[PDB]
XYZ file of C-alpha atoms in Angstrom:
488
model
C 110.284 57.801 75.258
C 108.884 56.587 78.588
C 106.932 53.361 77.966
C 106.522 50.111 79.916
C 109.157 47.981 78.129
C 110.671 45.062 80.004
C 112.964 42.194 79.102
C 113.472 38.827 80.767
C 115.012 35.402 80.549
C 113.223 32.050 80.490
C 115.248 29.667 82.666
C 113.987 26.868 84.902
C 115.599 26.396 88.297
C 116.861 22.904 87.300
C 118.953 24.406 84.486
C 121.074 26.454 86.953
C 124.691 25.176 87.114
C 124.593 24.167 90.808
C 127.138 21.598 92.016
C 124.755 18.857 93.294
C 123.447 17.210 90.115
C 120.709 19.739 89.447
C 119.953 23.464 89.686
C 118.737 24.735 93.073
C 117.604 27.821 95.035
C 121.108 28.505 96.370
C 124.251 30.362 95.304
C 123.763 29.921 91.534
C 120.186 31.192 91.641
C 121.473 34.374 93.309
C 124.328 34.667 90.795
C 121.766 34.445 87.994
C 119.621 37.180 89.563
C 122.805 39.323 89.830
C 123.335 38.743 86.111
C 119.696 39.770 85.351
C 120.168 42.965 87.358
C 123.566 43.854 85.860
C 122.236 43.403 82.298
C 119.078 45.439 83.003
C 116.584 42.550 82.803
C 113.371 42.927 84.836
C 111.770 39.487 84.335
C 112.588 35.888 85.159
C 110.346 33.077 83.899
C 110.468 29.651 85.481
C 108.500 26.459 84.886
C 106.190 24.986 87.573
C 107.955 24.329 90.881
C 105.716 21.364 91.731
C 107.229 17.998 92.796
C 108.358 15.800 89.900
C 108.881 12.063 89.572
C 110.735 9.546 87.374
C 107.343 7.995 86.515
C 106.073 11.157 84.812
C 109.305 11.769 82.881
C 110.298 14.388 85.487
C 107.769 16.799 83.942
C 106.946 19.923 85.979
C 103.436 19.730 84.480
C 102.581 16.267 85.855
C 102.934 16.449 89.635
C 101.324 14.896 92.700
C 100.589 18.480 93.914
C 99.830 21.842 92.260
C 100.706 23.579 95.536
C 103.851 21.893 96.884
C 107.455 22.675 95.975
C 109.952 20.270 94.398
C 112.464 19.041 97.005
C 115.252 18.342 94.451
C 115.485 22.131 93.899
C 116.545 22.629 97.523
C 120.047 23.946 98.189
C 121.697 21.402 100.535
C 124.426 23.886 101.554
C 121.847 25.710 103.720
C 121.421 22.451 105.638
C 125.206 22.528 106.237
C 125.037 26.150 107.437
C 122.263 25.332 109.934
C 124.261 22.400 111.414
C 121.705 19.839 110.196
C 124.275 17.922 108.124
C 128.060 17.471 108.193
C 130.456 18.703 105.496
C 131.246 15.138 104.350
C 127.555 14.542 103.512
C 127.928 17.124 100.719
C 129.001 15.608 97.417
C 129.892 17.562 94.255
C 128.914 16.415 90.757
C 130.450 17.843 87.536
C 128.344 20.288 85.480
C 126.219 18.327 83.027
C 122.609 17.318 82.425
C 120.161 17.161 85.349
C 120.738 13.920 87.219
C 117.107 13.344 88.263
C 117.444 9.686 89.302
C 120.399 10.437 91.561
C 119.172 13.726 93.087
C 115.784 12.234 94.082
C 117.716 9.734 96.211
C 120.591 11.982 97.306
C 118.574 15.057 98.332
C 116.011 12.815 100.068
C 118.851 11.340 102.126
C 120.239 14.777 103.031
C 116.742 15.908 104.073
C 116.085 12.742 106.098
C 119.337 13.347 107.968
C 118.555 17.048 108.459
C 115.115 16.248 109.881
C 116.743 14.047 112.569
C 119.034 16.875 113.721
C 116.065 19.250 113.821
C 114.737 20.836 116.626
C 112.824 24.075 116.094
C 109.365 22.519 115.606
C 107.613 25.729 116.695
C 108.701 27.309 113.381
C 107.126 24.348 111.595
C 103.791 24.997 113.353
C 103.610 28.624 112.154
C 104.422 27.431 108.632
C 101.625 24.842 108.779
C 99.087 27.498 109.792
C 100.105 29.783 106.906
C 99.682 26.903 104.404
C 96.864 25.055 106.214
C 94.654 25.060 103.104
C 96.940 22.582 101.184
C 99.856 21.388 103.360
C 97.965 19.346 105.986
C 96.485 17.351 103.127
C 99.722 17.083 101.137
C 102.002 15.972 103.968
C 99.421 13.363 105.030
C 99.003 12.272 101.404
C 102.770 11.691 101.179
C 102.913 9.829 104.517
C 100.144 7.384 103.548
C 101.647 6.897 100.068
C 104.925 5.987 101.793
C 103.377 3.459 104.170
C 101.004 1.577 101.864
C 103.381 1.996 98.911
C 100.343 2.710 96.728
C 98.511 5.569 94.969
C 95.513 7.259 96.641
C 92.902 5.553 94.435
C 94.374 2.170 95.468
C 94.187 2.858 99.249
C 91.617 1.315 101.570
C 88.180 2.715 100.743
C 87.965 4.759 103.953
C 91.225 6.680 103.399
C 90.525 6.851 99.650
C 87.219 8.684 100.191
C 88.596 10.754 103.086
C 86.243 9.552 105.827
C 86.667 11.944 108.756
C 87.543 9.409 111.469
C 89.917 7.303 109.343
C 92.007 10.410 108.503
C 92.417 11.265 112.201
C 93.637 7.758 113.077
C 96.223 7.465 110.313
C 97.580 11.002 111.000
C 98.464 10.256 114.620
C 99.953 6.911 113.540
C 102.215 8.450 110.883
C 102.767 11.648 112.896
C 106.548 11.566 112.563
C 106.337 10.955 108.818
C 103.711 13.687 108.440
C 106.029 16.262 109.989
C 108.989 15.172 107.837
C 106.991 16.130 104.760
C 105.967 19.524 106.147
C 109.638 20.054 107.105
C 110.652 19.405 103.484
C 108.069 21.943 102.275
C 109.196 24.371 104.992
C 112.801 24.188 103.761
C 111.724 24.718 100.145
C 109.399 27.661 100.718
C 111.819 29.451 103.054
C 114.569 29.158 100.434
C 112.212 30.494 97.754
C 111.063 33.333 100.030
C 114.697 34.409 100.443
C 115.394 34.176 96.712
C 112.197 36.044 95.861
C 113.085 38.924 98.199
C 116.507 39.160 96.587
C 114.847 39.344 93.142
C 112.159 41.867 94.189
C 114.634 44.296 95.813
C 116.439 44.410 92.454
C 113.213 45.101 90.517
C 112.952 41.607 89.053
C 109.448 40.156 88.722
C 109.108 36.398 88.558
C 106.833 34.772 86.027
C 105.605 31.434 87.305
C 103.676 28.768 85.506
C 100.281 27.256 86.369
C 99.454 23.957 84.680
C 95.811 23.700 83.609
C 95.338 20.280 85.201
C 96.723 18.201 88.066
C 97.703 14.589 87.484
C 95.145 11.946 88.457
C 97.738 10.717 90.956
C 97.800 13.884 93.065
C 96.766 15.150 96.491
C 94.582 17.662 94.607
C 92.240 15.107 93.011
C 92.286 13.091 96.238
C 91.150 16.139 98.293
C 88.647 17.515 95.779
C 87.215 14.588 93.761
C 83.911 16.422 93.114
C 85.931 19.085 91.217
C 86.730 16.458 88.534
C 84.677 14.188 86.270
C 84.904 10.874 88.111
C 82.480 7.963 88.467
C 81.219 6.234 91.633
C 84.621 4.607 92.303
C 86.495 7.943 91.799
C 88.070 6.662 88.562
C 88.145 9.196 85.697
C 84.996 9.259 83.568
C 86.726 11.583 81.083
C 90.373 12.598 80.571
C 92.194 15.570 79.075
C 93.983 16.156 75.798
C 93.765 17.977 72.474
C 92.263 16.909 69.117
C 94.146 15.810 65.963
C 96.074 18.656 64.271
C 97.859 18.860 60.940
C 100.988 18.817 63.135
C 100.105 15.643 65.078
C 98.204 12.782 63.436
C 96.098 11.441 66.319
C 96.319 14.275 68.873
C 97.776 14.028 72.376
C 96.336 12.135 75.328
C 97.455 13.963 78.480
C 95.688 11.497 80.769
C 94.644 14.101 83.354
C 91.081 13.950 84.655
C 89.010 16.861 83.334
C 87.316 19.419 85.543
C 83.653 19.192 86.421
C 83.324 22.930 85.791
C 79.703 23.105 86.906
C 80.921 22.129 90.415
C 83.593 24.874 90.361
C 80.974 27.466 89.537
C 78.781 25.995 92.297
C 81.546 26.545 94.907
C 82.243 30.080 93.612
C 85.530 29.040 91.949
C 87.152 29.043 95.401
C 89.628 26.248 94.556
C 90.929 28.258 91.598
C 91.035 31.369 93.780
C 93.116 29.454 96.348
C 95.459 28.302 93.534
C 96.038 31.896 92.469
C 96.470 33.257 96.011
C 98.975 30.461 96.772
C 101.013 30.997 93.626
C 101.137 34.796 94.225
C 103.147 33.974 97.401
C 105.819 32.751 94.983
C 105.365 34.708 91.753
C 104.417 38.130 90.421
C 102.884 36.817 87.213
C 101.057 33.567 86.565
C 101.333 32.072 83.107
C 98.129 30.172 82.433
C 99.048 26.938 80.692
C 96.538 25.916 77.987
C 94.550 29.160 78.460
C 92.108 28.155 75.693
C 90.801 25.433 78.041
C 89.001 28.153 80.045
C 86.804 28.778 76.981
C 86.502 25.131 75.911
C 88.460 21.941 76.614
C 88.982 18.675 74.765
C 87.275 15.808 76.602
C 87.794 12.104 75.694
C 86.197 8.954 77.274
C 88.406 7.063 79.766
C 89.797 3.807 78.400
C 90.457 5.340 74.985
C 94.001 4.765 73.696
C 94.110 8.008 71.679
C 92.465 11.455 71.810
C 90.673 11.061 68.456
C 87.171 10.332 69.797
C 86.798 13.375 72.048
C 84.752 16.570 71.872
C 84.982 20.250 72.719
C 83.187 21.101 75.961
C 82.522 24.730 76.933
C 83.976 25.932 80.243
C 82.794 29.017 82.196
C 85.818 31.230 81.498
C 83.875 34.499 81.474
C 82.431 33.831 84.949
C 85.726 32.502 86.329
C 87.877 35.402 85.253
C 85.309 38.048 86.271
C 85.646 36.709 89.817
C 89.437 36.207 89.608
C 90.003 39.783 88.377
C 87.745 41.077 91.172
C 89.848 39.228 93.754
C 93.108 40.079 91.939
C 92.411 43.399 90.156
C 96.093 44.255 89.397
C 95.977 41.328 86.882
C 98.865 38.889 87.327
C 97.705 36.680 84.447
C 99.504 35.806 81.228
C 97.808 33.569 78.679
C 99.549 30.651 77.023
C 97.331 31.000 73.982
C 99.393 29.041 71.497
C 97.693 26.252 69.541
C 94.003 25.497 68.939
C 93.178 29.202 69.159
C 89.792 30.506 67.992
C 88.236 33.984 68.048
C 86.158 32.883 71.063
C 89.433 32.324 72.917
C 90.924 35.633 71.749
C 87.766 37.449 72.869
C 87.948 35.870 76.339
C 91.597 36.842 76.665
C 91.111 40.430 75.468
C 87.905 40.981 77.453
C 89.985 40.700 80.642
C 93.063 42.474 79.197
C 95.202 39.403 79.718
C 98.430 39.554 77.651
C 98.820 36.785 75.100
C 101.960 34.934 74.058
C 103.901 35.293 70.797
C 106.955 33.371 69.618
C 109.195 34.613 66.813
C 110.098 31.005 65.930
C 106.494 30.688 64.598
C 106.785 33.901 62.533
C 108.183 32.646 59.215
C 105.815 29.835 58.144
C 103.388 32.459 56.787
C 103.879 35.985 55.381
C 101.237 37.605 57.644
C 101.895 35.564 60.809
C 100.699 37.230 64.007
C 104.094 36.286 65.490
C 105.966 38.670 63.171
C 107.324 41.657 65.176
C 105.173 44.220 63.349
C 102.002 42.272 64.234
C 102.726 41.954 67.982
C 100.617 44.437 69.981
C 101.752 46.011 73.264
C 99.773 43.701 75.553
C 101.796 40.570 74.834
C 104.705 38.531 76.055
C 107.047 37.950 73.059
C 109.411 34.952 73.216
C 112.357 34.020 71.031
C 111.447 30.438 71.816
C 110.014 28.344 74.662
C 110.800 25.211 76.581
C 108.448 23.176 74.308
C 110.474 24.241 71.262
C 113.950 23.777 69.876
C 116.213 26.750 70.602
C 116.348 29.203 67.686
C 119.713 27.901 66.416
C 118.495 24.286 66.248
C 115.169 25.362 64.776
C 117.058 27.234 62.060
C 119.224 24.198 61.313
C 116.135 22.181 60.303
C 114.150 25.092 58.841
C 112.810 24.450 55.320
C 114.039 26.503 52.350
C 110.754 28.429 51.978
C 110.591 29.540 55.607
C 114.287 30.483 55.431
C 113.468 32.695 52.430
C 110.743 34.480 54.380
C 113.144 35.035 57.301
C 115.923 36.430 55.093
C 113.469 38.702 53.260
C 112.143 40.042 56.574
C 115.705 40.958 57.658
C 116.520 42.209 54.185
C 119.516 39.887 53.879
C 120.790 36.326 54.106
C 122.488 35.616 57.445
C 124.787 32.832 58.642
C 123.271 30.238 60.957
C 125.392 31.310 63.975
C 124.123 34.933 63.700
C 120.404 34.010 63.603
C 119.917 34.143 67.383
C 121.196 37.711 67.573
C 119.020 38.852 64.650
C 115.860 37.355 66.139
C 116.637 38.657 69.609
C 116.821 42.156 68.067
C 113.442 41.612 66.338
C 111.838 40.570 69.621
C 113.412 43.496 71.542
C 112.511 46.148 68.925
C 108.837 45.093 69.050
C 106.267 46.990 71.091
C 105.423 43.889 73.168
C 105.539 45.099 76.773
C 107.426 41.935 77.904
C 110.213 40.476 75.749
C 111.560 37.120 76.945
C 114.669 35.341 75.671
C 115.072 31.619 76.333
C 118.471 31.127 77.961
C 119.532 28.618 75.274
C 119.083 31.358 72.644
C 121.211 33.792 74.659
C 123.915 31.100 74.703
C 123.457 30.326 70.983
C 122.788 26.594 71.555
C 121.250 24.086 69.146
C 118.819 21.149 69.259
C 120.942 19.376 71.893
C 119.860 22.018 74.465
C 116.116 21.557 73.852
C 114.298 21.441 77.191
C 111.175 19.481 76.146
C 109.888 17.603 73.102
C 106.063 17.401 73.342
C 104.658 13.942 72.627
C 107.830 12.169 73.770
C 107.436 10.860 77.339
C 111.108 10.648 78.437
C 114.451 12.456 78.031
C 113.049 15.898 78.777
C 113.671 18.643 81.352
C 117.319 17.697 81.616
C 119.158 20.651 79.998
C 121.464 22.673 82.227
C 123.830 25.581 81.769
C 127.370 24.176 81.462
C 129.245 27.391 80.535
C 130.002 30.815 82.052
C 126.908 32.673 80.827
C 128.036 35.982 82.432
C 130.477 36.526 79.531
C 127.346 37.410 77.520
C 126.623 40.370 79.815
C 128.191 43.269 77.860
C 126.609 42.134 74.596
C 123.062 41.677 75.937
C 123.202 44.737 78.244
C 124.021 46.901 75.221
C 121.094 45.410 73.283
C 118.562 46.005 76.068
C 119.642 49.659 76.246
C 119.512 50.139 72.465
C 115.878 48.923 72.342
C 114.798 50.708 75.512
C 114.317 47.631 77.712
C 117.243 48.235 80.078
C 116.289 49.213 83.591
């Protein structure tokens, strides 16, 4: 048999066991890629690399920029190698949960110190040209936010509405601060470029993640207000979310401003094209968060406390993706098409041959679930579980008797709770899904304590890190990949 059959691991950079309070793009990232290669994995899925904040619960999906990189993921040991900091500035922390509060402050201090002892500004100018379409705006956005200590919609009216002359004045004023913020982005993107080359030379493709929406408090809304549904004062007229389920009682209010899609179509979808081009500098595949929003999105009036009184509004997905697939004909797209799926959505997805998502954790609530292995078609990415879900072992712990029965009957036997991960990994690998992805927590057989994110809950999330030597799992998982024809 000679089919396209790949396997991968879902693991966010923060979860790497790096020594400085959080995972980074340094030694441990390379060690993890070595582990991928040795096992025969071909795929690595990360979450969005956009800057995070305490205010937004450290969520990768609520950032002040859809383009920028997150400075807390920077490896500070490269700063030591380039003689930008001293050895005593480095400061080890024991392996535990991601120390967001402390790394925001600590890595900012290391980068402030490195910028002082820096020097090669000509390399910064070439970087700025390459990323001119977003970085001039982002670095200036960050410099003004620093000075005024306020969000963009609270700034003086002239800077808020991006009057040409006012932008020039404030740039020259905060010139030193402007270049600090490009320097931070320079350091991040150069470290990712190096890591990406290492991955690519070993046949590993990186699956990145594109959030549907920016946060209202972002350089993106600031720079392109007409691309969102705002009123005369640039406050949101409508905001994003999803309607009430039988899961949730009153839906979720995401609080993003919604797109004015008629304006995107008017400008030939060039903002979305720029998003894709930018992200393809980093990633091989782009997972489209809330894919169903390209067919229709839930829109609720601003000022509403819940998402109950919204409505479905059609978006121009057919026109958008026709243009995107013309610009990017090798098709980097993966659809996150879980939840609120209709046949309209499935038709949009399949019209453009975009692989869907399936998750075996969803397979045993119904006897004919489309997430059962035998129902997963080739053009799909098949997960054991995702970062929005409990790891398989913790899911199984709380699984109801009826769903347990369905699981046991599918395997043909009752199995002990500690063996469930292995059994479900096998089911995912034996499927004909072209990409099979195991969440790292499942590989390590971890429970509810290792859950990355709990949707609905604002805080406590995105903190899980590897604490153990995961390379001990290599002989077991390597064997499995080879048995099910996904070892390369």
